[PDB]
Amino acid sequence: MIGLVGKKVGMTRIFTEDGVSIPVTVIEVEANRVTQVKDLANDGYRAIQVTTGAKKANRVTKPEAGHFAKAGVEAGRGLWEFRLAEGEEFTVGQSISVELFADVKKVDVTGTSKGKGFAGTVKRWNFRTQDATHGNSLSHRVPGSIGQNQTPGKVFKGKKMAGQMGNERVTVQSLDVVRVDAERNLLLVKGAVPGATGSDLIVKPAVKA
Template sequence: MIGLIGKKMGMTRIFTKDGISIPITVIHFNTIRITQIKTILNDGYNAIQMTTGFKKISRMNKAEIGHFKKAKTEGGYILWEYRLKNYNPENFHVGQKINIDIFKQIVKVDVTGISKGKGFSGTVKKWNFKTQDASHGNSLSHRVPGSIGQNQTPGKVFKGKKMAGQLGNQKITIQNLHIIKLDFIKNLLLIKGAVPGYTGSNVIVKPAIKI
């Protein structure tokens, strides 16, 4: 089953009848249109290309203008593609609009987004390494990682060694998030828990694979 492109609006909370607080993330879905249908015969694989939102013609290049004109749809600000194993051409067509109705019978979803970038970070922040002694003779080595290898044998640092480096700004998928509510009037999806990305970032919401 395909997913939808949404925008993370932020987090809030709701209360149950018993007074229990539930943290939720609000995701808004703009008008989503199919711009291209790819097939094994023409493209080597089955996929559906979609766009969301609206973009002025003055902001698009000629390739984008021609692509949306061929699909006979209004230009969107982003293009996304979903690969399909079992493709039925009768279910989709170019120009078709898709909304959150596809989540009516869905209980859990998987949400994919780009996590917040936090720059170059040390091992304590990035990997939760334990810090060394604050005093008792220790100086200048409070947050250093320590030894990163062994001896003359093997004489190298193994691949995958946890060291300082870029933290965040990665594609992350959070699985099995419960759907709390669907607002068909405002095109909002309320999901229990947090999803990756900053407020205003794009996220992909798909029906959960592992249930």
């Protein structure tokens, strides 16, 4: 069980004696039924599924191992009914969050940040903005220069512009686990978590805390 996964519910907060008041993001972490686990290998730098472990297959778990010893194994995802899990497959695949999750423990939560169509350079890849009177010239979120040397009237592919997005993966580290509570088996993560509500976020023991 390299980690668990839940669905973002929203953002709340819990004032704890130790530490100090800090917003907490509620995440629904519940019953799953992992039938198999797909393992990827790092051939150069292009993910490829080595093998898949079923309810009973020592011929695939063996390759999974060793490859891990070779450190060539990539991210691990397994055919699941609801959400993922690792060593959970070997048992029966049926498990609850209570089995994997403790509080006050550090965890790395990654996820795809929240279709928005085309956006302006600024609202887009964080481009700053026309500070100074530049803003007064109502030219707020515009680079003002598509590219140097009008000739070519071309914009260097580099010279970042506007485009499409939405519909970026980010793995924030050191996310303390406040507690596991709510109407349903959920999780309280300190601070905020990438992605919108309902989005699928994964948990993983902090690589370095």
